[PDB]
Write a protein that binds this DNA or RNA. Structure first.
Ligand SMILES: [Mg+2]
Ligand SMILES: [Mg+2]
Ligand SMILES: [Mg+2]
Ligand SMILES: [Mg+2]
Ligand SMILES: [Mg+2]
Ligand SMILES: [Mg+2]
Ligand SMILES: [Mg+2]
Ligand SMILES: [Mg+2]
Ligand SMILES: [Mg+2]
Ligand SMILES: [Mg+2]
Ligand SMILES: [Mg+2]
Ligand SMILES: [Zn+2]
Lengths: 108, 152, 219, 115, 300
RNA sequence: GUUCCUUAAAUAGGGACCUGUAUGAAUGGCUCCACGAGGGUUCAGCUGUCUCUUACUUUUAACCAGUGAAAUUGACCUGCCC
RNA sequence: UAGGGUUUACGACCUCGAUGUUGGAUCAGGACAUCCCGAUGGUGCAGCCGCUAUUAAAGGUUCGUUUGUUCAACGAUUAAAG
RNA sequence: AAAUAAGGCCUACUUCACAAAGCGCCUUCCCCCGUAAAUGAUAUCAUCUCAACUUAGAUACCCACACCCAAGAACAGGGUU
């Protein structure tokens, strides 16, 4: 069980230098059309994902401020708006949740 | 051996994993977006598929009511579910949940993904937009199709 | 309009061509004999033909304990204590040694598998060998003689007290006690009842099977 | 099914099998290359502190499809030539033994009922 | 491989390309459906020493089959899909012939394979099993081989992979008895005890040890055929067959000494639908097989 | 040990013989009411201990991230047969 | 007259600043002075049952009751429990 | 027809379920040197050859990014119309 002979530096090098253990190079790094932050295939961007996360967090904070206490969950849909923008004539009963913000160049 | 085996073991047993999946489904029904590992993400997506199916079956049905009361621990999401996610998708059949992928976690580096119901009021996600039709290969294929059509 | 449980395939992935060929063979076989539809707990009487017996024609009576299998395999055990001796024969509806499949009754007994009859006293097993049929109410709800079954002393062979079996027929009040019922319920799994992923849908498959049966009957 | 040390239930008119005893008679040895007994096989049976041959007439495990399955290890006694000891068997006997005709002829003639 | 095709295609060219691929494959199959009409090379009669080309079917499932004597006999399922010849090579030790099977998409393949399959008709297949045939029977490439190649009452061998159980232990890999549960084991229940002797400080090559079970080609000899189907091109072989369901299997004539000189009634080259041959019924039965629909048996 | 049983086999258990030649009496000889985690057998039930083992959950194992020891080592470019 | 170091010893030649002691479990490698499946000669070979000498080790070599003991007694098997 | 050891399978039977396993089912094929016999000399008899010459005397598997997997610890492999 115990080492009968210490491994030589040559053996150690040959063990810790073969291609099987070396980090395999990858070639799945493209250029994201948005903000060019070199994204990966089959994976979303980084800056766009952070922006979406921040927007969702702000929307959730606004909903909580409007909803109030916990244990609510109304049975009505939601509609997000921005500075100005008259509410859509189709969504009149849906509770509107917004505050102050400008529509970015990627939100419908 | 695991030939043709479904349900990947997660927690310390069936009860733990099903409770975790139920909690994830409740969180998604409450917020419509969760960042969870790929395995748990796909499991919760498959569960929410049947959940929406049951919700669409009908509200007066005692089976669907019991399923909604069980799979939802808060007990406040059952009406929202039944009255929003069932009538909104009255035209679809099985086009729910949109799964993607997250780069990785900044802590232990884990494969995470995102899933959400279509038509949500939240901002849109950067879906993988295919190449435009005005490219070289697309134009060549369009010309080939036009020639094949004119051949008749 | 109930569809025999032999046509409904299993969830196992495979080529539908195999199931189609199996259904075609089953229909071609049924075209000869009759093979009436029956549920669990119903008394049956299959007249088979054996190569060595008092006459090439054989007979036997019993209650269908259960039934499973797919394709040409439609097994069903027939229970009938004769001369104070338990006997069980595993017959298949798609055998060449079949002539007549007479049905005496049509019951369900709630439980879809009367495998606990082996542990039950002989009173709920002995039946007449030359009994007459009992038909009534054509095309109507099948009767269900909802009745409990007393069990022998504690020495069993399958632990029917646990809830995983789900019988809803054994009379545990006249056999088991409070501690036994508690120890049995200890191994409960309420999550299985709510597991909506284990259910195997069959609406489209049932419609396809009915369409194929109609096409085969009309041609 | 009927291997070594198995409480065998005898069913014959022989006084040795019908008389009671303070020890249940169980098999002795299986006359087969393998350690498993089936229908139509000779086996030694200890009865009343004495050794005597027997014959397996039905087991408790599930056999082939077109065959029965008893709930008790039914066994019938037999001598050297056999030449069965008993004279009447009220319990049923599977028809699988009828294919013998030569090895156990008198046993079939004495058999009353059949499955 | 290189970059997968579905990368630079918009949301309108994918279905068009799929339909074009399907139409091209169907047209090639329809054009190759006529072997006799095209140069089929001279056909020779049956000879004492000569073999024929085999088939490559798909193992669907299993089902029982009772004979006229009233006995259960397990039977397998083999679907003969397309099954075309690729090329022919003369003298190695004997002539050879390549045969395909299923139709695999021509997108995830090597450029050399794509060029080779473009030189000939039909689309690229999955596997390519080479059969050791004699110089007598020599079929031209591009011809089909349906299930009619074989006939009932014939022993046909089959070989294919097996349900690999991965790097298994010892008991499941070789059937070892392991160690008891008590008296007085503490950590020994499935491990291998002694290796081999003591003084020998080596290990006998080939000694039974943990390894990758299954996942290897294994042939089975002695498998009788009961019934065959012409419409769906199915072959029902007796006994099980190596390989999981929906797995390609190589089938060819047997090789036992008692079954070698009996192909006089069988087609020496291969079945030819175009004839000048008299088509066969929906499915040929056997002399000792209960037909579907025949009256019940009776041993009286 | 002889001797009769207890089972299919009994150097396991027990009924009597002194021949224990070195047993034998408050260095205590014998029976007995209740009892023994003390040491050896057994009748009707019991379980995977085996006949022949298999399926599932966890502990646990492998990979991806972090840290991170000890027993030990003359150097090894370390095969096999006579 | 030739072969054995498998039993009992005989000698203490490195191994008491360590080679962990028998049976019983999984696994068996090899040798034939071969129990059996293959082939021969003789025989106190009318045939089986037998005996002897040569080749053939590709294969097989049981289930249990006791004493801790391989060995040691016994019940039933198959051609054999080397 | 049964077992032995090996190669496979879940459609019927069971442990059980989207699998796997056996109690359940299919397959396993080549002679082995030890003898007995034509024809004649050393030894014109006779005689089987450590004298010349004749009798019982290889077949099988193979060699063109990303999702799922009956393939797999990774790696690797199969499918992705
Ligand atoms: Mg875990
Ligand atoms: Mg074991
Ligand atoms: Mg242990
Ligand atoms: Mg660890
Ligand atoms: Mg690490
Ligand atoms: Mg140390
Ligand atoms: Mg010395
Ligand atoms: Mg020493
Ligand atoms: Mg010392
Ligand atoms: Mg030392
Ligand atoms: Mg010798
Ligand atoms: Zn971006």
């Amino acid at each position: 069980a115990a080492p009968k002979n210490r491994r030589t530096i040559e053996v150690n090098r040959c063990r810790r230098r073969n291609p099987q253990k070396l980090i395999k190079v990858k070639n799945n790094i493209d250029v994201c059309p948005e903000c060019g932050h070199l994204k990966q295939k089959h994976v979303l961007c980084a800056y766009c994902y952070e922006k979406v996360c921040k927007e969702t967090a702000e929307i959730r904070r606004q909903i909580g401020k409007q909803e109030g206490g916990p244990f609510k969950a109304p049975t009505i849909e939601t509609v997000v708006l921005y500075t100005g923008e008259t509410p859509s004539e189709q969504d009149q009963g849906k509770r509107i949740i917004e505050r102050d913000r400008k529509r970015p160049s990627w939100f419908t | 051996i695991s030939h043709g085996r479904v349900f990947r073991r997660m927690g310390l047993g069936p009860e733990s994993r099903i409770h975790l999946l139920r909690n994830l489904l409740t969180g998604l029904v409450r917020h419509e977006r969760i960042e969870a590992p790929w395995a748990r993400v796909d499991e919760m997506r498959g569960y929410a598929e049947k959940l929406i199916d049951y919700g669409k079956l009908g509200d007066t049905n005692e089976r669907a009511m019991r399923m909604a009361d069980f799979w939802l621990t808060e007990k406040d999401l059952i009406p929202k579910l039944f009255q929003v996610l069932a009538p909104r998708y009255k035209d679809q059949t099985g086009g729910y949940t949109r799964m993607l992928q997250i780069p990785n976690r900044s802590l232990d580096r884990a494969k995470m993904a995102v899933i959400e119901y279509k038509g949500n009021c939240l901002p849109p996600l950067p879906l993988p937009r295919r190449d435009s039709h005005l490219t070289l290969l697309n134009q060549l294929l369009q010309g080939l199709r036009q020639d094949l059509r004119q051949s008749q | 309009r109930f569809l025999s449980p032999e046509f409904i395939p299993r969830r196992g992935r495979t080529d539908p061509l195999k199931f189609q060929i199996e259904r075609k063979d089953m229909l071609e076989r049924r075209k000869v004999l009759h093979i009436p539809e029956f549920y669990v707990g119903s008394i049956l009487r299959v007249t088979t033909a054996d190569p060595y017996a008092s006459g090439k024609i054989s007979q036997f009576l019993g209650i269908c304990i259960q039934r499973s299998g797919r394709g040409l395999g439609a097994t069903f055990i027939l229970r009938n204590v004769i001369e104070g001796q338990g006997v069980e024969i595993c017959f298949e509806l798609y055998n060449p040694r079949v002539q007549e499949i007479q049905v005496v009754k049509l019951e369900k007994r709630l439980d879809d598998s009367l495998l606990y009859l082996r542990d039950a006293l002989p009173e709920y097993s002995t039946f007449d060998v030359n009994m007459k049929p009992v038909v009534q109410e054509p095309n109507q709800k099948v009767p269900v003689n909802e009745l409990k079954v007393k069990m022998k002393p504690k020495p069993w062979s399958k632990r029917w007290e646990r809830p995983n079996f789900n019988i809803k027929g054994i009379r545990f009040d006249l056999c088991l006690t409070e501690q036994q019922m508690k120890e049995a319920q200890k191994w409960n799994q309420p999550w299985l009842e709510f597991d909506m992923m284990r259910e195997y849908d069959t609406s489209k498959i049932e419609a396809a099977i009915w369409k194929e049966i109609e096409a085969s009957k009309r041609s | 099914a009927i291997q070594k040390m198995t409480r065998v239930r005898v069913v014959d008119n022989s006084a040795l099998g019908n008389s009671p005893y303070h020890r249940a008679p169980r098999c002795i040895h299986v006359y087969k290359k393998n350690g498993v007994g089936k229908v139509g096989d000779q086996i030694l049976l200890a009865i009343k502190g004495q050794k005597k041959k027997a014959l397996i007439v039905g087991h408790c495990m599930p056999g082939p499809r077109m065959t029965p399955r008893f709930d008790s290890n039914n066994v019938v006694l037999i001598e050297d030539n056999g030449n069965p000891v008993g004279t009447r068997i009220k319990t049923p006997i599977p028809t699988s033994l009828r294919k013998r005709e030569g090895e156990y002829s008198k046993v079939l003639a004495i058999a009353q009922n059949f499955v | 491989s290189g970059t997968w095709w579905d990368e630079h295609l918009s949301e309108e060219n994918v279905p068009f390309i799929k339909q074009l691929v399907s139409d091209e494959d169907k047209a090639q199959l329809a054009s190759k459906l006529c072997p006799l009409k095209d140069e089929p090379w001279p056909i020779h009669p049956w000879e004492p020493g000569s073999f024929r080309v085999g088939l490559i079917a798909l193992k669907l499932g299993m089902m029982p089959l009772w004979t006229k004597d009233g006995q259960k006999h397990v039977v397998t399922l083999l679907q003969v899909q397309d099954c075309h010849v690729l090329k022919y090579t003369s003298k190695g030790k004997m002539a050879t012939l390549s045969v395909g099977g299923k139709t695999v998409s021509r997108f995830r393949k090597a450029t050399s394979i794509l060029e080779f399959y473009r030189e000939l008709g039909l689309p690229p297949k999955q596997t390519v099993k080479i059969f050791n045939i004699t110089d007598n029977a020599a079929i031209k490439p591009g011809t089909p081989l349906y299930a009619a190649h074989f006939r009932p009452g014939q022993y046909v061998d089959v070989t294919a992979k097996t349900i690999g159980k991965g790097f298994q232990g010892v008991m499941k890999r070789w059937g070892f008895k392991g160690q008891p549960a008590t008296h007085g084991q503490t950590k020994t229940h499935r491990r291998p005890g002694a290796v081999a002797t003591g003084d020998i400080g080596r290990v006998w090559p080939g000694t039974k040890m943990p390894g990758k079970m299954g996942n290897i080609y294994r042939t089975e000899y002695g498998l009788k055929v009961w019934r065959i189907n012409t419409k769906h091109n199915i072959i029902y072989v007796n006994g099980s067959v190596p390989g999981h369901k929906n797995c390609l299997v190589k089938v060819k004539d047997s090789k036992l000494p008692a079954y070698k000189d009996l192909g006089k009634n069988l087609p020496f080259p291969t079945y030819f639908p175009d004839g000048d041959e008299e088509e066969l019924p929906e499915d040929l039965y056997d002399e000792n097989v209960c037909q579907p629909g025949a009256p019940s048996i009776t041993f009286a």
